[PDB]
Amino acid sequence: SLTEENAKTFLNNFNQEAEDLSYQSSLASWNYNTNITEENAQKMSEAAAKWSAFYEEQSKTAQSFSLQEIQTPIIKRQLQALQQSGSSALSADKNKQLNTILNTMSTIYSTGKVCNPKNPQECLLLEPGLDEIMATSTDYNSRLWAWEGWRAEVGKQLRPLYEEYVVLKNEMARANNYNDYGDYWRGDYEAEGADGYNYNRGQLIEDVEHTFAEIKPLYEHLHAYVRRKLMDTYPSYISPTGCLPAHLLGDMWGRFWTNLYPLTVPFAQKPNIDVTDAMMNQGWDAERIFKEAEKFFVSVGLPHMTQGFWANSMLTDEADGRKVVCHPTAWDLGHGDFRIKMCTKVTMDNFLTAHHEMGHIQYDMAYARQPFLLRNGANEGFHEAVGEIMSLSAATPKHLKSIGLLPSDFQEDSETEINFLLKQALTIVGTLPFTYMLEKWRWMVFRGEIPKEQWMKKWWEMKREIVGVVEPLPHDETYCDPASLFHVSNDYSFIRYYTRTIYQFQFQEALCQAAKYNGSLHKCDISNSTEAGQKLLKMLSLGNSEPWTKALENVVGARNMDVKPLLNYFQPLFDWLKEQNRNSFVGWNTEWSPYAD
Amino acid sequence: TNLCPFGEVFNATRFASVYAWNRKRISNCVADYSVLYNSASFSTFKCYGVSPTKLNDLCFTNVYADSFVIRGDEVRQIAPGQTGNIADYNYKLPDDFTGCVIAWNSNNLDSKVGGNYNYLYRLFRKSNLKPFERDISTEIYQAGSTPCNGVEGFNCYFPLHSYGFQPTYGVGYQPYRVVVLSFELLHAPATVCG
Ligand SMILES: *[C@@H]1O[C@H](CO)[C@@H](O)[C@H](O)[C@H]1NC(C)=O
Ligand SMILES: *[C@@H]1O[C@H](CO)[C@@H](O)[C@H](O)[C@H]1NC(C)=O
Ligand SMILES: *[C@@H]1O[C@H](CO)[C@@H](O)[C@H](O)[C@H]1NC(C)=O
């Protein structure tokens, strides 16, 4: 009759074919990432090409279905999701140029070398030749030159690349009814279709600003605090009032801050919790590490992991003979194929990433019910947070005690809490300023509201006004620093690692509210209950069938990024940071010059 | 007055696609379903008639035995009244049906790596089918009202699709072989004994 029945029929056919096409393509991709050879490398080509071709051909057809007569919401969202040609809105030549330039980015990140200026022979690369230099080697000039040379090389080798890439992606997003590729990314939160649940595509910036000035006090506190000890280390370069120098930071870029753990640890006498030697002297292997994570998810009431998972996964580096990728990832191929890819050295951290990846899975396993276009997390943000509240609820002393993985006499004193909360803060409140600054810079660089001739100037200006980090030397616009970050010149929506942060703590409190919990948020577990699992499941098994605001409201009762609960989680550290800051200058100025003599 | 090919129905190695489900009428059996009942290896023994006991004790007139192949999560669809993706386009039992539905996951046998494409199932059709009536047809399905004259194109689709099995699947997407025993008693002197 009307376009409704024709749409429904087309969706039936598209599902029943796309499932198998995707399965075969992704299983080829899997077999590559487990058994890298030339054979499986080639075999990745044909199936991926087949999938991309099916998508092109079957999307071009679903445009005669003009969305004016779609009354039912499910089909409306489905067609709205399928009617995107990705980058196809370009002519074939521009699309070729775009994939070419993207691959230049990917490879020029995979390569890239710098040779020490006094050691013209020890010439290393970003990955594990430069990471360990700028993680623990405390000598100032060493890391200074390391960071400097990396930025300089990748700048001279990437500035024109990103320079033209911005214009190309901008024209692409322009051809698909979007102001800029920044609007393209933002359109990932554009969820709508109910009473008030309509979340616009521009409201995102408003919620970001609203949610970031509320967290600013904690981060200024912790920044001044860390600056105290980092000035105690080098009382010759750190400024008593200005922001701390860039290169002398935790990781390569400053995005994470857990690498600067010892130089500014709290009182260095308390035993930081870890159970490496504990199960190491009990003789646990990878499979026993995962047995416990599965037991944790089956306790809370989430579904029991499946038998195909245990025989097809890659729990541990096999005997030898094969060249693996060695990076933990959760593959869900489809059709009920759930697999985990990771090299498992018995360790505390490889005991929490277990929980994280199995959370990724336990999510992908719940929404294996929707019609295959509603098979992504409620948005691009819920996913890396569902597999994260399970991690943070596994680092409590109470959990480790329950399984008896540490001495069953631990006292859980104040100092333990403070050291642990600072440990977690140096990543969770350290990633937020840089993430937000970088994403607010990309958003301002797509919209052309800043000159192409002026990209690094305002870049470092925002860096030092919203993150609190000054550049070691004043680079000119012959460089393009932030492209150096992996997530920049590899086309990933990076605001994802912002939102989930807020999200997870929100989620945390939600379960802790229903899990009948009393104490401080940070000292909480979720196991040995059912409602604390089912109240998550009710949103877990929806995909993006429903506009993410409703899915969110099913568990939190709120409707937006609502960061009260984060500051509640870091409340003890908030107080103790205040107390350690009774005689410091919370805040910074911008006058430190690299060299004004 | 002898045992009859129940085994030859079950232990065959060529089970036919769901839509083209073959049927092997059996007659004049000294039939012992209990050497079936005590298998304890089937994935689905849901009976809709009399207990295995009274089956073994009573002699019926004539029996019919269906056999086909479907994914895992569709062994519940073969049942007296159940809608679904196939369920009424490939094999739709009636309302008072009085036979049993045997089903077993033989993943290893029926599903070879790379894809055992030789199994077909009929997707969207014009109308809901009836008891026991197979549909072998392959006439193109006309979505709207535009004529396409027997070539799949814009809003013109092929009914028979195929779910390519594999061994690396879920417990619900694997080839669950199924066999349906439909009995009936009429005015004729009952033949299949036990
Ligand atoms: C690994 O790859 C080789 C050749 O690429 C192949 O012969 C072998 O069967 C593969 N191993 C597995 C476990 O798939
Ligand atoms: C959960 O309950 C089991 C038995 O009821 C007990 O052995 C275990 O210690 C409990 N763990 C937690 C974290 O409550
Ligand atoms: C197995 O199949 C063969 C050939 O179809 C048949 O002769 C045999 O009787 C079957 N097995 C049993 C136990 O009947």
Numbering used by the authors:
A (entry chain A): 19 to 615
B (entry chain E): 333 to 526
What sentences appear in the manuscript?
As expected, the RBD of WT SARS-CoV-2 presented no detectable binding, but RBDs from different passages of mouse-adapted strains (RBDMASCp6, RBDMASCp25, and RBDMASCp36) gain gradually enhanced binding abilities to mACE2 with affinities ranging from ~500 to 2 μM. Finally, to elucidate the molecular basis for the gradual changes in specificity of MASCp36, structural investigations of the mACE2 in complex with RBDMASCp25 or RBDMASCp36 were carried out. However, only the tight binding conformation was observed in the mACE2-RBDMASCp36 complex structure, reflecting a more stable/mature binding mode for the RBDMASCp36 to mACE2, akin to that of the RBDWT and hACE2. We determined asymmetric cryo-EM reconstructions of the mACE2-RBDMASCp36 complex at 3.7 Å and three states of the mACE2-RBDMASCp25 complex at 4.4–8.2 Å. The map quality around the mACE2-RBDMASCp36 interface was of sufficient quality for a reliable analysis of the interactions. The overall structure of the mACE2-RBDMASCp36 complex resembles that of the RBDWT-hACE2 complex with a root mean square deviation of 1.0 Å. The RBDMASCp36 recognizes the helices (α1 and α2) located at the apical region of the mACE2 via its receptor-binding motif (RBM). The interaction area on the mACE2 could be primarily divided into three patches (PI, PII, and PIII), involving extensive hydrophilic and hydrophobic interactions with three regions separately clustered by three adaptation-mediated mutated residues (K417N, corresponding to Clus1; Q493H, corresponding to Clus2; and N501Y, corresponding Clus3) in the RBM. The extensive hydrophobic interactions in Clus3 constructed by Y501 (or Y498 or H498 in other mouse-adapted SARS-CoV-2 isolates), Y505 in the RBDMASCp36 and Y41, H353 in the mACE2, hydrogen bonds in Clus2 formed H493 (K493 in other mouse-adapted strain) in the RBDMASCp36 and N31, E35 in the mACE2 and hydrophilic contacts constituted by N417 in the RBDMASCp36 and N30, Q34 in the mACE2 contribute to the tight binding of the MASCp36 to mACE2. Contrarily, structural superimposition of the RBDWT over the mACE2-RBDMASCp36 complex reveals the loss of these interactions, leading to the inability of the RBDWT to bind mACE2.
